[PDB]
């Protein structure tokens, strides 16, 4: 027909090897920018003054790092929450010093990943599917917004966002424990149950479907060729798996509806992970984990320590050592 | 559509009550997190100046001013980690501010006792505390029963905003699926993908 | 926290394999449940879709073909073999926990992966060399000295205030 | 960086040897 429509039909085409779509129009360039900046910085970025104290932290392979110690380093505390595009710097040299690649990378990524989510909806609509896969992905997405966006906001600086690195991630976890007692927070307890329980049910669902595969092969061939793709029928006896697992425990602790069984597998880790990301997002505003320090005392008033008091000694050692040259006054209020 | 709208609004509300001390007066709601962090620096400038410190020339350990430094556009601001927070503006502090930021002459001469009081009150009421309402940092001992209304209101309204965004996606996608006629699953007799050419 | 400050357990390849196996299990769990729930066939005329499944039916209750296409085109690959997919689900988390179990046996012996020697040799000579690796070690030292007297009472650790390690102010 | 110099040969063979094993087995499947 006309140009705009031939292009609109190419964009929303269900015959492209990779679906594009309108979300895909924003997604592709922003992931490409984030990915290219990240690969170049990880390898070659010079040191970055993360805490605003003129104490640059080296994160790149060419400056003495390996895969496990390297990272793209958060922008400086002197910036705090100010926007810092390249064009705001007097030179790439200044920008590199003050941590600009980190801001470039996380905005293009957060943006491109939010459109990933919409793309999952978009292609399900062109395919005639039910639409809620994207809802599941929102649990990891939301977790990423937490450590890269929400937590910096509440604490007033992208310098306290999660670093883009293996060791940098551990750094962020430890400082989080000292400053918020995340282990004592119920939302993170909900997150562990989230992912332990997910892996559990993952091993269980697989183990129980693999246990009930229908003999379709001989002992010399992979069982896997007993299934052919798009075949009309099922390749395991669910009645048989219910009979096994219903007896492992008792009959009604066992699912016999395929649909109920899979919705359960979707919902458990999604919700848990919603809670732990909700928990990072509310500790962004210093609503922290339970505090039972010196909560038990005797007739006279002596402190009878509990395990919570031992945790606080750990927390305290992280507290006093982190960012060792960055505090001039006795409280660490952000 | 309305779930989408309300989500956006709870997020804005979240940020309003955390940063804004005009329609959320700190007289009523306690200090903002930046306000408390700034008030801590003021406290210890005052005390040390009383003892005899020349606070404008005090080099701290990093080479940055212990008490006063420049922001990245040059303004004079409180030192230490609160450098992230120099955008703070509050009626107890604006008095000491000149054209290039904090005025050292006003710091030396014009700090009233009401400001020393506000500044100490606000740093000891910083919006930090635990879920069972022990107030302070996480390593604090029980004693002080306090969690700032700013924390209670911003946390609760982020949670709500997030779950209403999830609401949007759930109901928006369902509403599209339903108006197209495949909200209840794929039609076995007409499975669209089967009329599609293979990707390879 | 003990394992962080004494063993540096986060830096350990065997825990990293376990972590990948657990978070990977949770990933497969969620994404397979959502794929089945969002490719289901219409097998009843009601809005609750759960009531359209009989355990004894022969037919697959969802479309493997359309699921595959979705993921081929969203992610570039998809599963095509339903047996392989469920075996992989048993495999990933089960193999993760086994790998973490191996690392702990090393910690029984204090055979930690605590350091990178090359980093220490440089940091010791070069006081401007700082990485996240060295920041994390300083945190460990803090954990050890602050928690041990009370974590290990039987040792009667006495640390005068002046030997406790601390940054400025805190 | 004063790294361990057998690290190169250890990484190299750690990659090469099992990768050659798989390639040997894939190509001789394709030709039957």
């Amino acid at each position: 027909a006309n140009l705009w429509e031939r292009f609109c039909n190419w964009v929303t085409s269900t015959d492209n090897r990779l679906y594009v779509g309108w979300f895909g129009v924003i997604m592709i360039p922003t992931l490409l920018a984030a990915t290219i900046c990240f690969v170049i910085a990880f390898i070659a970025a010079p040191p970055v003054d993360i805490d605003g104290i003129r104490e640059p932290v080296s994160g790149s392979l060419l400056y003495g790092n390996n895969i496990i110690t390297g990272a793209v380093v958060p922008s400086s505390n002197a910036i705090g929450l100010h926007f810092y595009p390249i064009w705001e710097a007097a030179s790439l040299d200044e920008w590199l010093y003050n941590g600009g690649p980190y801001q470039l990378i996380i905005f293009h990524f957060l943006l491109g990943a939010s459109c990933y989510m919409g793309r999952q909806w978009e292609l399900s609509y062109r395919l005639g599917m039910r639409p809620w896969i994207c809802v599941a992905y929102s649990a990891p997405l939301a977790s990423a917004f937490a450590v890269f966006l929400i937590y910096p906001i509440g604490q007033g600086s992208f310098s306290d966002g999660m670093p883009l690195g293996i060791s940098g991630t551990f750094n962020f976890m430890i400082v989080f424990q000292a400053e918020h007692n995340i282990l004592m927070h119920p939302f993170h307890q909900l997150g562990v149950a989230g992912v332990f329980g997910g892996a559990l049910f993952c091993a269980m669902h697989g183990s129980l479907v693999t246990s009930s595969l229908i003999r379709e092969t001989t002992e010399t061939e992979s069982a896997n060729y007993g299934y052919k793709f798009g075949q009309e029928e099922e390749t395991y006896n669910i009645v048989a798996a219910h009979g096994y697992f219903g007896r492992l425990i008792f009959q009604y602790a066992s699912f016999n509806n395929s649909r109920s069984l899979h919705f359960f597998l979707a919902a458990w880790p999604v919700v848990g992970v919603w809670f732990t990301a909700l928990g990072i997002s509310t500790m962004a505003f210093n609503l922290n984990g339970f505090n039972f320090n010196h909560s038990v005392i005797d007739a006279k008033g002596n402190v009878i320590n509990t395990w919570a008091d031992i945790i606080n000694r750990a927390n305290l050692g992280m507290e006093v050592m982190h960012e060792r040259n960055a505090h001039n006054f006795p409280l660490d209020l952000a | 559509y309305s779930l989408g709208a309300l989500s956006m609004m709870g997020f804005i509300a979240t940020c309003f009550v955390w940063f804004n001390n005009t329609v959320y007066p700190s007289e009523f709601y306690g200090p903002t997190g930046p306000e408390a962090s700034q008030a801590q620096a003021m406290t210890f400038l005052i005390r040390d100046q009383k003892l005899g410190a020349n606070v404008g020339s005090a080099q701290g350990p990093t080479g940055l001013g212990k008490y006063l430094m420049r922001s990245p556009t040059g303004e004079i601001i409180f030192g230490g980690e609160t450098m992230r927070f120099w955008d703070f503006r509050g009626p107890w502090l604006e008095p000491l501010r000149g054209p290039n930021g904090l005025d050292l002459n006003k710091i030396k001469n014009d700090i009233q006792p009401w400001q020393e009081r506000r500044a100490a009150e606000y740093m000891t009421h910083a919006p930090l505390g635990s879920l069972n309402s022990v107030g302070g940092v996480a390593t604090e001992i029980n004693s002080v029963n306090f969690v700032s209304p700013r924390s209670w209101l911003a946390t609760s309204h982020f949670v709500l905003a997030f779950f209403f965004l999830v609401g949007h996606l759930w109901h928006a996608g369902r509403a599209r699926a339903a108006a197209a006629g495949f909200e209840k699953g794929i039609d076995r007799e007409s499975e669209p993908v089967l009329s599609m050419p293979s990707l390879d | 926290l003990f394992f962080q400050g004494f063993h540096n357990w986060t830096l350990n390849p065997f825990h990293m394999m376990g972590v990948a196996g657990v978070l990977g299990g949770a990933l497969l769990c969620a994404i397979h449940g959502a794929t089945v729930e969002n490719t289901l066939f219409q097998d009843g005329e009601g809005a609750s879709t759960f009531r359209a499944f009989n355990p004894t039916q022969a037919e697959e209750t969802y479309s493997m073909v359309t699921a595959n296409r979705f993921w081929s085109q969203i992610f570039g690959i998809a599963f095509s073999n339903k047996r392989w997919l469920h075996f992989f689900m048993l495999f990933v988390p089960v193999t993760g926990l086994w790998m973490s179990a191996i690392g702990v046996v090393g910690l029984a012996l204090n055979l930690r992966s605590y350091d990178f020697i090359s980093q220490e040799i440089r940091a010791a000579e070069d006081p401007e060399f700082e990485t996240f690796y060295t920041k994390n070690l300083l945190l460990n030292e803090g954990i050890r000295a602050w928690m041990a007297p009370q974590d290990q009472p039987h040792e009667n650790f006495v640390f005068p205030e002046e030997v406790l390690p601390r940054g400025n102010a805190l | 960086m004063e790294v361990n110099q057998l690290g190169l040969i250890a990484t190299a063979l750690f990659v090469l040897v099992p990768s050659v094993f798989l390639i040997i087995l894939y190509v001789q499947t394709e030709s039957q």
Partner: peptide, 30 residues
């Protein structure tokens, strides 16, 4: 030399992505 090794392995993995997507066994429907 160590940087070169880390980057080479990373580069090979990106190459493997490309072939695994674009040169996969094409799934078909018996």
């Amino acid at each position: 030399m160590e940087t070169i090794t880390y980057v080479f392995i990373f580069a090979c993995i990106i190459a493997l992505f490309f072939f695994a997507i674009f040169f996969r066994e094409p799934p078909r429907i018996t």
